[PDB]
């Protein structure tokens, strides 16, 4: 629990903009707000599901694992469980 600070999604779908925006991958939140200008597939595939889950799209662009290793250093929490799925 104490070394993980929760979002409810209802947070995280606020920071959809370029001052700070956020996503969601597998169950974790990350500030992307500095790696927009870095991403190899450009920015407007990003704003288009900032402040939401995108580990689907995520996955099936297929991310190397360099593109994996690259996601720790923006990780900043965990989605709260009530908005987890059930199963
Ligand atoms: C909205 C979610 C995301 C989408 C739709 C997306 C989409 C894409 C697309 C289309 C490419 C180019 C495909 C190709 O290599 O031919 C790409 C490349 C890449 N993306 Fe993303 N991306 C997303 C999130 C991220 C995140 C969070 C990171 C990590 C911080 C990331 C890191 C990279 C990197 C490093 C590449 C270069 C190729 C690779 O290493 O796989 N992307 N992305
Ligand atoms: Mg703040
Ligand atoms: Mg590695």
Redesign the pocket.
Known sequence: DPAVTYYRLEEVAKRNTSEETW?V?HGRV?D?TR?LSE????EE??R??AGAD?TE??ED????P???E??KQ?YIGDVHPNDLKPK
């Open positions: 996503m991958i990350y992307l790696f991403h190899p597939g450009g595939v990003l288009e599901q995108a799209s995520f662009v297929g991310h190397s360099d593109a994996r690259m996601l923006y």
